[PDB]
Amino acid sequence: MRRSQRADGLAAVLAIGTANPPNCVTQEEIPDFYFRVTNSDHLTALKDKFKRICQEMGVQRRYLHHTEEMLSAHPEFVDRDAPSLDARLDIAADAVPELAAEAAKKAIAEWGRPAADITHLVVTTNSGAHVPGVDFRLVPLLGLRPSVRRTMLHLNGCFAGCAALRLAKDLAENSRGARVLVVAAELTLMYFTGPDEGCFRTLLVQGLFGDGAAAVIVGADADDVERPLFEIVSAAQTIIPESDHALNMRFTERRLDGVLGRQVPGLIGDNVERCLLDMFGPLLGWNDLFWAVHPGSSTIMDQVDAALGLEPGKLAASRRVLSDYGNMSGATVIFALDELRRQPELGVMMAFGPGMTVDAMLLHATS
Amino acid sequence: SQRADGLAAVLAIGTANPPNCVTQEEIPDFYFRVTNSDHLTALKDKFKRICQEMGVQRRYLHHTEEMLSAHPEFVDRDAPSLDARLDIAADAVPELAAEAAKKAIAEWGRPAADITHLVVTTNSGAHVPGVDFRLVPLLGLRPSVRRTMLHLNGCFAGCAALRLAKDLAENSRGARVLVVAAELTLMYFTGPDEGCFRTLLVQGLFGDGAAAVIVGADADDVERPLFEIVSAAQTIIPESDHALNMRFTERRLDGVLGRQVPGLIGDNVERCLLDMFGPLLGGDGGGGWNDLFWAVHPGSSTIMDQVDAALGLEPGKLAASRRVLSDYGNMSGATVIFALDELRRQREWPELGVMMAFGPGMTVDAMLLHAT
């Protein structure tokens, strides 16, 4: 027999919606919040270091699902040695679908079609470890059809957003009329703990990471009501050799833990241009493109600017998101795309994560 | 921007299991000794019954007495031990997966360098970089292989990964997708509970394994397609999330194995298949559901009996699925791929068939297959 009916055009971003927990904390307030809630206000020298750390990261505010009352109800969280994964996951099991549903509802309202018209759902988050997972939970929350084709991607780290969208391109293009809802979400309560007594990596997490969810509707062959924002021309992925030790994460009994190596910015700076040329090559002056890049930190952005000889305005959307929300793992790069669209015909949407891996898409912007 | 022309096809299947084989006859003694539980005479009786009567004859386990001695906290139901289990799995899963993958590649007949996409699924890991990244140097994949790592998708995981593979293979010309599902039961291993028997079920029914599949459209002269994937679909049984679930905990991978599971499958399977495939199941035939071949995730003999009774299947239809249960036990997402492989060595045979798996949700993932 023959193939099913497929799409004609490229998969396109048709809508983007985003969401954050209500608890907003500025960089200036973060030291006071973190040191109070972890019973560490007597550690003056350490607090002062954290203050200086926080000022150099390019983050101005973030949104946190956890609050003083939540942490008071869960003192095990601040104890670096206490098992507490169960309690973190229990909160995440409820909170992530709620936050994801809020972002998805806004994407669907922008899209202009009913939730019942979604045929595929791709969900990615580090902040979950359940079957049925967030993908299942969204079904009744959004009123999806029971036969929606779901993909649950637990724990894919910083490249997770781009990884999920790469999948959505193929799902959207391989069935006529397919409409894919992509959701990435991140809750930093999974990492939250008391101060370290080494090189300050929990403090790095505290200064850099925030919570959010981003939802994207992806579809080929837009109809009359739909409004394509970007076509996904190509989606690729590659590996920086000999760099798995520099960045990694895993579930533990105590929390989501890992390594945020000082090598990371340099590795990105040294390799980004070659990665893009290996990934896209034939399909493409880096200043002739637009950019939606997973920010990481101010330093990582500086590394990317330098490596690619980028003008100041090129990473502005990506920097803005970092400034306004902090790093939200997989969702961050989609916030960046959303910011870019609010602010060249061809462009690059990319994210680096553990591996080290780069996930990137070549995007074409509706004129 | 060059797409494939025709249907995605299964081009090779390769499987692997840990070397330690354990028969159902020796399991009761072994388990009750190693968990210091020999005084629980009646509990062990329940366990014997579970081991003898639910359709499993042998299993392959990565964990051994030696490994259990080195990790006594595994045996303690209250001790945090997720780190130690995950540390073992970080190394063992990619090795087992690599063995299955290499057999699939050898059957396939092209070099590993020709693989363009990799889709990996396991309950037995929680790492970034994950098993997918680890397989790159193990198999000699190109660094630019497009990887998808699906942690913790339960029993439907193998079917869900193949659903992805179909679209990946069909939307890019020349694309060749390696799909691997692997499962290690040391993730769940623990001592028994006298009041409740969910642990006894896991210890009686679940085994370890890895299965690998090469998926591609537009077969070469050198490739030998085994099955074309006509359609891949998924659906939900309403009001059944309480019956069956799983999660990471501090102590182990844990969950619920409800009494109602076989009955829910029996009550809903026919409706699910008809919802999922619709007009594609039109035509006849002469034997209704017996017109088709079947590769289904087994679960238990009762679950297979429920599928039989629901679809009016003759004894031979689920024989390949029951044989897998018998020879390997349940290996989560990998099991239905073992079933497809058994079916393939078993073979006028039906042209059209269903490959399906039920998991938490409850969800069914299913593919309509055309054998060529």
Question: Beta strands of chain A (E only): which ranges?
Answer: 12-19, 23-26, 61-64, 120-125, 130-131, 149-154, 179-186, 212-219, 230-239, 247-251, 256-260, 290-293, 346-353, 357-365
Chain B partners within 8 Å of A170 (Cβ): 167-168, 171-172
CA distance A8 to chain B (A): 11
Per CATH, B1-225 and B226-372 having the same topology is answered: yes
CA distance B49 to chain A (A): 28
Helix (H) or strand (E) holding B107: helix B82-108
CB A169 within 8 A of CB A218: yes
Which of B186, B183, B184 minimizes the C-alpha distance to B75? B186
Chain B residue with Cα closest to A88: B249
Interatomic CA distance for residues A80 and A61, integer angstroms: 25
**Phi/psi at A241 (5° precision):** -60, 150
What CATH code would you report for B1-225? 3.40.47.10
The experimental method behind these coordinates is: X-ray
Interatomic CA distance for residues B110 and A243, integer angstroms: 29
Q: Which of B3, B7, B74, B167 to mutate to test the interface with A (most CBs of A within 10 A)?
A: B167
What letter would DSSP give residue B209? E
Burial class (CB in 10 A: 0-12, 13-18, 19+), A88: buried
Q: Which of A126, A170, A259, A283 to mutate to test the interface with B (most CBs of B within 10 A)?
A: A170
* Amino acid in position B221: D
Q: What residues pair up with A51 in beta bridges, in sequence order? A: none
Interatomic CA distance for residues B366 and B372, integer angstroms: 19
Q: What residues pair up with B209 in beta bridges, in sequence order? A: B183
Mode of pairing for the β-strands spanning B293-296 and B352-359: parallel
Residues A158, A162, A199, A275: which is the catalytic one? A158
**Topology annotation, domain A229-367:** Peroxisomal Thiolase; Chain A, domain 1 (3.40.47)
CB A47 within 8 A of CB A31: yes
B21 as an active site residue: the answer is no
A46's CB contacts (< 8 A; 6+ apart) are A40, A195, A200
What letter would DSSP give residue B361? T
Interatomic CA distance for residues A261 and B342, integer angstroms: 47
Domain extents for chain A?
1-228, 229-367
**Which of A133, A235, A244 lies nearest to residue B129, judging by beta carbons?**
A244
Q: Which two tokens stand for residue B307?
A: 């599928």
Q: B242 in contact with A at a CB cutoff of 8 Å?
A: no
**Residue B287 CA to chain centroid, in angstroms?**
29
Interatomic CA distance for residues B61 and B208, integer angstroms: 5
Mode of pairing for the β-strands spanning A346-353 and A357-365: antiparallel
CB B90 within 8 A of CB B126: no
Which of A5, A10, A8 minimizes the C-alpha distance to A346? A10
Look at the block and give the residue holding tokens 């680890």: B134
Residues B47-71, buried b or exposed e (16+ Cβ, 10 A)? Answer: bbebbeebbbebbbbbbeeebeeeb
Match domain A1-228 to its CATH number in 3.50.50.60, 3.40.47.10, 3.30.2290.10, 3.40.50.10420. 3.40.47.10
CB contact under 8 A, B167 and A146: no
Residue B187, CA atoms < 13 Å, CB-side half-sphere:
28
Interatomic CA distance for residues A214 and B157, integer angstroms: 25
CB A337 within 8 A of CB A365: no
Alpha carbon separation from A237 to A363, B256, B339 (Å, rounded): 15, 37, 32
**Which of B133, B246, B370 lies nearest to residue A1, judging by beta carbons?**
B370
Chain A residue with Cα closest to B122: A154
**Topology annotation, domain B226-372:** Peroxisomal Thiolase; Chain A, domain 1 (3.40.47)
